Amino acid sequence: PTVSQLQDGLEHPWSLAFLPAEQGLLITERPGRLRLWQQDKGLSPPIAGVPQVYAEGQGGLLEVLPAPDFAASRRVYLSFAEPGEGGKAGTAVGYGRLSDDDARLENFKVIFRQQPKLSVGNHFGGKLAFDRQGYLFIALGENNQRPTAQETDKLQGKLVRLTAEGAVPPDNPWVGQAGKRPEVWSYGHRNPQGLALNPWSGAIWEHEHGPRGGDELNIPLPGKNYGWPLATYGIPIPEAKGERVPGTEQPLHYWRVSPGLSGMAFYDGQRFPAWRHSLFIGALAQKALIRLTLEGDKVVAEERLLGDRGERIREVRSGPDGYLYLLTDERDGKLLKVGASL
Amino acid sequence: PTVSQLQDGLEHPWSLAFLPAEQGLLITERPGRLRLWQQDKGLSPPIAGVPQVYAEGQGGLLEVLPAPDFAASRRVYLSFAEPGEGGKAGTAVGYGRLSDDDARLENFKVIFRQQPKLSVGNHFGGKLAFDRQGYLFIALGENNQRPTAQETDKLQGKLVRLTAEGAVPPDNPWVGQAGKRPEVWSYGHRNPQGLALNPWSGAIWEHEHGPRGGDELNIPLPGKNYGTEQPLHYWRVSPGLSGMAFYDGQRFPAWRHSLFIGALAQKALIRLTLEGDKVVAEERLLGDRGERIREVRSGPDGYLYLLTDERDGKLLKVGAS
Ligand SMILES: [Ca+2]
Numbered sequence: 001p002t003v004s005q006l007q008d009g010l011e012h013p014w015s016l017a018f019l020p021a022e023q024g025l026l027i028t029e030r031p032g033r034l035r036l037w038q039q040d041k042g043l044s045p046p047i048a049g050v051p052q053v054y055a056e057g058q059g060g061l062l063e064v065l066p067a068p069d070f071a072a073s074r075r076v077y078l079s080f081a082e083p084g085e086g087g088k089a090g091t092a093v094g095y096g097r098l099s100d101d102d103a104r105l106e107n108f109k110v111i112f113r114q115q116p117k118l119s120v121g122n123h124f125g126g127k128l129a130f131d132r133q134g135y136l137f138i139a140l141g142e143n144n145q146r147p148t149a150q151e152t153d154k155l156q157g158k159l160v161r162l163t164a165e166g167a168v169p170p171d172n173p174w175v176g177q178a179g180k181r182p183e184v185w186s187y188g189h190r191n192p193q194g195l196a197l198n199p200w201s202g203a204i205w206e207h208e209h210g211p212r213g214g215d216e217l218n219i220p221l222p223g224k225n226y227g228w229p230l231a232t233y234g235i236p237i238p239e240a241k242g243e244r245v246p247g248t249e250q251p252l253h254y255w256r257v258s259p260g261l262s263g264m265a266f267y268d269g270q271r272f273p274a275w276r277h278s279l280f281i282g283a284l285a286q287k288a289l290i291r292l293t294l295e296g297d298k299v300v301a302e303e304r305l306l307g308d309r310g311e312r313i314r315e316v317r318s319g320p321d322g323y324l325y326l327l328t329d330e331r332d333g334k335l336l337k338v339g340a341s342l
Numbered sequence: 343p344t345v346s347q348l349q350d351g352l353e354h355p356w357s358l359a360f361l362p363a364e365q366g367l368l369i370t371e372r373p374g375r376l377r378l379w380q381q382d383k384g385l386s387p388p389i390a391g392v393p394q395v396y397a398e399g400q401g402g403l404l405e406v407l408p409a410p411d412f413a414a415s416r417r418v419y420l421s422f423a424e425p426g427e428g429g430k431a432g433t434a435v436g437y438g439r440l441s442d443d444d445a446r447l448e449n450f451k452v453i454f455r456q457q458p459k460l461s462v463g464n465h466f467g468g469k470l471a472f473d474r475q476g477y478l479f480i481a482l483g484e485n486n487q488r489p490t491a492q493e494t495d496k497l498q499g500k501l502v503r504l505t506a507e508g509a510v511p512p513d514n515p516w517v518g519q520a521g522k523r524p525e526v527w528s529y530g531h532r533n534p535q536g537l538a539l540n541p542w543s544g545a546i547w548e549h550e551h552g553p554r555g556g557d558e559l560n561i562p563l564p565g566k567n568y569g570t571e572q573p574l575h576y577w578r579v580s581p582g583l584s585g586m587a588f589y590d591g592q593r594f595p596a597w598r599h600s601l602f603i604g605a606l607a608q609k610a611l612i613r614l615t616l617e618g619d620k621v622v623a624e625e626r627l628l629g630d631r632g633e634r635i636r637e638v639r640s641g642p643d644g645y646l647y648l649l650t651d652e653r654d655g656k657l658l659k660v661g662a663s
């Protein structure tokens with residue numbers, strides 16, 4: 001593979017996303033700053049109007065996601081860890097409009113809040129993804145309070161589906177059911193750090209860290225239980241009943257030795273035809289890029305890229321130019337451009 | 343891939359080798375036992391006459407390797423951690439003759455000793471491999487004394503080349519040079535655990551836990567310093583490479599021109615796609631089994647054979663599809 005370093009000096013960068021044409025791409029730095037990067041002008045100063053964040057541990061500014069109609073609307077969504085009280089925190093999502101001069105994020109407002117706020121530093125999740133009709137999917141961690149992922153009245157360990165405005169879709173699975181949060185798409189998740197739309201099936205796919213082993217890839221179905229913490233391939237965990245539990249869904253694919261899955265992008269560009277129908281996932285702990293070959297919904301091969309570089313891969317996006325774009329997670333974090341051939 | 347669990351109950355198996363004409367496999371258990379496994383009879387009792395070993399840490403009985411003329415000579419080489427008298431240990435290599443009833447090793451004699459003995463339990467290396475002209479390559483760890491790998495007068499961190507009888511070839515790169523060990527082929531290694539002859543190039547390839555951290559795969563050149571020379575392929579986070587085999591059989595075309603390497607820490611079988619001397623792809627296999635892969639050999643029947651590194655160690659037969 002070909003690697004070009006586009007930018008360095010990003011403090012613990014977490015998310016990136018492309019603006020249309022040649023407008024560049026946005027990057028979050030977890031301490032709490034939003035940046036714009038462009039081919040010709042380099043890295044912008046911090047964009048004004050970003051919310052205050054809970055920058056403890058794993059928390060801070062998390063995902064940046066332009067709206068599907070950003071070209072018309074210039075709307076930008078952000079996820080972030082939002083402080084509560086008692087020293088605790090929880091995930092939040094809002095949007096604002098990027099100025100036409102790219103300098104400030106105006107009118108930013110929270111449209112969704114994880115409740116209750118149980119995190120003291122870990123397991124916010126935070127990945128966002130739009131499906132084909134523009135519903136917003138929000139992957140939420142269980143905030144390190146394991147059992148709450150199963151509790152139907154708590155937004156811990158939940159994949160959430162909302163409208164573009166953050167309202168509850170009238171046909172969400174638990175709408176009008178007592179003791180169940182109507183935002184919820186699927187439950188039983190641990191700490192999801194990958195979320196992406198399969199461009200061939202239209203299904204949202206998800207992946208999450210397991211506890212000391214047991215990283216998983218799932219295709220989350222509405223109303224279904226993904227096991228945590230009753231079912232796990234990690235290690236056993238107190239509440240765990242095994243690797244398989246009736247009434248809970250098995251992962252699509254799992255790793256007994258956890259690479260530290262972070263970020264995920266399906267490759268559909270034509271620049272590198274060998275890469276089409278592949279799913280690319282970052283590995284934090286094993287410091288490499290994972291490439292899964294797909295046959296429909298089946299994983300038929302696992303390959304490793306970039307393991308010689310020694311960089312924790314936090315983010316993976318498939319660019320409209322046909323290249324992969326990555327973020328590396330350290331204090332001198334980098335934006336990398338990656339191709340297959342020459 | 344397909345997997346057949348051929349044998350269980352092996353206590354930390356380390357190395358395997360095929361005997362000719364389907365007479366079975368020799369298998370070493372790191373504690374200090376040599377065994378013959380046969381598909382029709384299972385596992386033999388331990389073979390008598392094996393040397394005493396230093397079975398501490400990574401040390402013990404390590405490589406088994408029959409001579410290329412085994413069918414006539416029945417000569418079998420062993421590498422092993424040999425105890426010292428100051429509580430140091432070092433790698434030793436010897437050979438004896440496997441008795442005609444497979445029961446004992448006859449007159450086992452040591453033909454090479456790593457000197458000085460510097461290890462206290464780590465970095466013996468121990469892999470063995472013949473080239474096409476029949477020289478014996480011996481991969482030696484640095485005994486976890488890092489500077490010695492560079493020291494031209496120490497046998498730590500060295501790839502060694504001897505004749506089959508343990509003589510120094512007059513051809514070796516350091517013969518005639520002063521203060522240099524004439525046994526040495528290449529130097530600057532840390533802990534090699536893979537050593538295999540490329541069947542298409544005729545060159546010895548090697549992999550190791552590498553001296554800058556992580557693991558690496560090399561094509562060691564005579565007299566060259568491996569740290570200076572740079573790897574064919576590098577893993578910054580060590581999978582725990584162990585074992586190495588090139589696939590040139592006919593049974594599975596998709597695997598021809600692949601290099602297979604075991605992963606101890608990441609518990610998987612690594613398949614590297616080769617185009618000449620370059621690695622163009624790395625696939626991961628058998629991760630679902632959760633086993634530490636210690637040894638990999640290409641079998642004469644076109645399957646891969648693996649040993650797993652556990653108290654309840656396994657012999658596995660692996661095919662494509
Ligand atoms: Ca699960």
Ligand SMILES: [Ca+2]
Nearest residue numbers: 568569571573
């Ligand atoms: Ca080297």
